[PDB]
């Protein structure tokens with residue numbers, strides 16, 4: 001049996017310190033790590049955020065839950081796979097520790113954010129919401145064309161949290177368990193960039209006016225949404241060699257969607273989805289940075305100056321892509 005053999009390699013392995021694993025570093029790369037090592041790093045994130053302790057999680061159950069999450073990503077999808085989820089969670093961990101956000105949030109909020117980060121792209125098919133709408137997918141029918149993928153990832157998140165031996169939330173009060181599932185749903189839906197674009201203006205306005213206040217529950221929920229997007233997009237902040245490699249993965253997934261469009265829908269893909277247009281990736285990345293990323297990382301740095309490395313890396317990669325676009 002291959003599954004029991006993975007569980008045993010994992011629950012008996014020593015979990016190295018966060019310092020040894022480099023998971024506190026905003027610049028962290030997963031590329032040299034084995035699958036088992038990514039699982040050990042995940043355990044370390046739950047432990048050093050005091051979640052295992054504060055929520056009385058049994059080791060074996062956390063181990064089983066992590067391996068269930070990992071297995072429920074599609075390995076053949078080029079970008080939206082377990083490594084992206086793992087890296088998103090790692091960025092969350094770095095933001096909370098190095099970025100000093102941990103002290104601004106409750107243990108219950110942190111718990112939800114970490115589970116949401118790990119689960120937020122579960123079972124991603126490697127095509128966009130717009131593709132799912134255009135093909136009349138059963139998912140888009142179930143969810144009325146609204147954040148289709150994200151509703152699906154949340155469904156998958158609940159399926160895993162409820163599977164026998166994977167119940168990492170069992171130590172909570174019933175009221176706190178319900179509140180936590182609601183925060184997880186909000187966090188996963190927030191990763192729909194359509195919702196990011198709708199909500200960002202309010203966030204930026206509060207910061208511009210010098211009025212942002214995390215003690216206000218509405219502003220706190222807005223912040224959690226923004227933080228999820230910041231972690232989700234964080235490959236754009238990484239050291240140049242890592243960003244170049246990840247950008248190639250993103251483009252591979254987009255081009256594969258375009259190939260499906262050309263055959264299943266008989267349409268001409270747009271340049272973003274057309275492999276013929278690979279030479280345009282530098283200009284497309286500069287556009288992505290300018291339209292979406294820069295202002296988000298600027299805004300996050302206002303909330304915590306210790307998150308500056310994310311902004312710094314984003315700006316460095318903009319220069320690198322712009323030089324290739326010329």
Ligand SMILES: CCCc1nn(C)c2c(=O)[nH]c(-c3cc(S(=O)(=O)N4CCN(C)CC4)ccc3OCC)nc12
Nearest residue numbers: 232233234235236247250251272281284285287288291
């Ligand atoms: C859903 C994927 C979001 C995303 N994550 N990361 C790390 C990237 C990235 O590096 N690039 C792009 C990207 C965005 C645009 S875009 O801003 O123009 N954009 C197209 C996609 N939609 C959904 C939003 C707008 C164009 C090209 C891109 O990648 C080329 C490798 N998207 C993401």
Ligand SMILES: [Mg+2]
Nearest residue numbers: 120121191192
């Ligand atoms: Mg997603």
Ligand SMILES: [Zn+2]
Nearest residue numbers: 120121191232
């Ligand atoms: Zn994602």
